[PDB]
Design a protein around this ligand. Structure first.
Ligand SMILES: Nc1nc2c(ncn2[C@@H]2O[C@H](COP(=O)(O)OP(=O)(O)O)[C@@H](O)[C@H]2O)c(=O)[nH]1
Lengths: 203, 174
C-alpha cells in the first residue's frame, strides 16, 4: 500500500487527509519511516525533507502527523536527524531545510524533539565559491539562520528551553558563525547592512 | 564550546557492534549520529556514532559514511576465532582506501564469553579454540593503532574505557 513513490507523492502534495493507515500498516508489518526501502536512494532524502522542500504558502501539514507515527513506531532522534548521505547535499537535515525555506513554524517543532542544532553540511554544494560550490554558510544551522538574515531564528536556537545552540561551536574548517558572515560578503549596501546588524548581535 | 568527531565503528557482522553502541548511548541495528556527550580529559566532547552495516554486502551505502571519519573502531569477537582475521583481509584495506590516515582502536567485545561453558563445548567441537589477547595484540601491532581495549557489552566495565582511548586519538593531529 505504501511504497516509496506513492507516499513521497503524498507528502509533496500536502495531504494529511489520505495517509490514515501508515500507523496500522507500518506497525503490523514492523517497519520504520527511515528504513532504506522508504528513502530516495541517491541523496538519503526522507519524507520530512520532502515536505519542507514542497511547501504550500509556508505550511505543509504533513510534518506533524509523520512525527507522530515516527513516535508511535518510535524514532525521533533518528527520523528527524537522518541526514543526506550524498557528496552534493551532505549533512543537510530537515532543520537545514527549515531555515533556508525561512520556515520558523517548524523549527520550534523540530528542536522540541531534540533534532540537531550543530549538524554540519559538509557537502560540495554547501561549500564556498572557490572550491566547486555555490553557498558557504559555515556548516551549522545557527550559521545559516545568521547568514540568511533571520534574527528571529538566531534568537530561538540560542534561548530555547529544549536545546540551546552556542555561537562558539566550531565547524569542520574552524570558521565560527562570525567568520562566516565575513566569508559571505558581496559588498553591496544590503549585504553589509544585515551582516553588521547580525555580526553585532552575536558578539 | 565543545568539539565533535565522527565514529564509524567497523566489524565483521554479529561481532556485537551495535549492542555496544546501545550501552554507551543510553547509559537496535541502526545508529545515525546519535550525538553522545563524553568528558574525556576536561573538554566535554560530543562523539557522533556512525554504526555501519556489517557483512550484508551494503558496499552501496558502506563507503558513504567514512568521509571525515577520525576514530575508527575495528571490532572482532572473542568467541570468534581466526574468522577474526577479516581485519587485514577486508576491513583494514577498505579503511586504507576510504579514509587516508586515522586512528584505529581495535575492539574485541564479548569478553564475558570466554569462560562460557555453554559455547565452550560448541567452540571446542569447532577445534578452533577461541582467541588469546596476545593473538590480537599482534593484530594490533600489525595494523598500527592507539589501543587494544578488548570490550564487554552485557556485562559492563569495558564499554567506558574503549571510548577514552578512541576519542583521545581523534583529538590528535589531522
Ligand atoms: N552474551 C553476550 N551477548 C552479547 C554481548 N554483546 C553483544 N551480544 C549479543 O550480540 C547480539 C547482537 O549484536 P550486534 O551488535 O547487533 O551485532 P552486529 O551485527 O555486529 O551489530 C545480541 O543478541 C547480543 O546478545 C555480551 O557482552 N554478552
Amino acid at each position: 500500500v505504501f511504497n516509496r513513490p506513492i507516499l513521497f507523492d503524498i507528502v509533496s502534495r500536502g495531504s494529511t487527509a489520505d495517509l490514515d493507515g501508515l500507523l496500522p500498516f507500518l506497525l503490523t508489518h514492523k517497519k520504520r519511516l527511515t528504513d532504506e526501502e522508504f528513502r530516495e536512494p541517491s541523496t538519503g532524502k526522507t519524507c520530512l525533507p520532502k515536505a519542507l522542500l514542497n511547501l504550500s504558502n509556508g505550511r505543509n501539514d504533513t510534518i506533524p502527523v509523520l512525527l507522530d507515527i515516527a513516535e508511535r513506531t518510535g524514532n525521533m532522534r533518528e527520523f528527524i536527524n537522518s541526514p543526506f548521505r550524498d557528496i552534493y547535499y551532505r549533512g543537510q537535515t530537515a532543520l537545514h531545510i527549515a531555515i533556508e525555506r525561512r520556515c520558523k513554524h517548524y523549527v520550534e517543532l523540530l528542536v522540541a524533539q531534540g533534532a540537531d542544532v550543530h549538524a554540519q553540511a559538509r557537502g560540495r554544494f554547501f561549500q564556498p565559491k572557490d572550491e566547486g560550490g555555490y553557498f558557504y554558510f559555515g556548516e551549522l544551522p545557527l550559521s545559516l539562520a545568521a547568514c540568511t538574515n533571520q534574527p528571529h531564528i538566531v534568537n530561538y536556537l540560542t534561548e530555547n528551553p529544549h536545546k540551546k545552540a552556542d555561537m562558539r561551536r566550531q565547524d569542520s574548517r574552524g570558521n565560527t558563525v562570525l567568520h562566516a558572515l565575513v566569508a559571505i560578503a558581496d559588498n553591496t549596501r544590503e549585504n553589509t547592512k544585515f551582516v553588521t546588524k547580525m555580526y553585532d548581535l552575536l558578539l | 564550546a565543545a568539539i565533535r568527531k565522527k565514529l564509524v565503528i567497523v566489524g565483521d557482522g554479529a561481532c556485537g557492534k551495535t549492542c555496544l553502541l546501545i550501552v554507551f548511548s543510553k547509559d537496535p541495528t541502526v545508529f545515525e549520529n546519535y550525538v553522545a556527550d563524553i568528558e574525556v580529559d576536561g573538554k566535554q566532547v560530543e562523539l557522533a556514532l556512525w554504526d555501519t552495516a556489517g557483512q550484508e554486502d551494503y558496499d552501496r551505502l558502506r563507503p558513504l559514511s567514512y568521509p571525515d571519519t577520525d576514530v575508527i573502531l575495528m571490532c572482532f569477537s572473542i568467541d570468534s576465532p581466526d574468522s577474526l582475521e577479516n581485519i587485514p583481509e577486508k576491513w583494514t584495506p577498505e579503511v586504507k582506501h576510504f579514509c587516508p590516515n586515522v586512528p584505529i582502536i581495535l575492539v574485541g567485545n564479548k569478553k564475558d564469553l570466554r569462560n562460557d561453558e555453554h559455547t565452550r563445548r560448541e567452540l571446542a567441537k569447532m577445534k578452533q579454540e577461541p582467541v588469546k589477547p596476545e593473538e590480537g595484540r599482534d593484530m594490533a601491532n600489525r595494523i598500527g593503532a592507539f589501543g587494544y581495549m578488548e570490550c564487554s557489552a552485557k556485562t559492563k566495565d569495558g564499554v567506558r574505557e574503549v571510548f577514552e582511548m578512541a576519542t583521545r586519538a581523534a583529538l590528535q593531529a589531522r
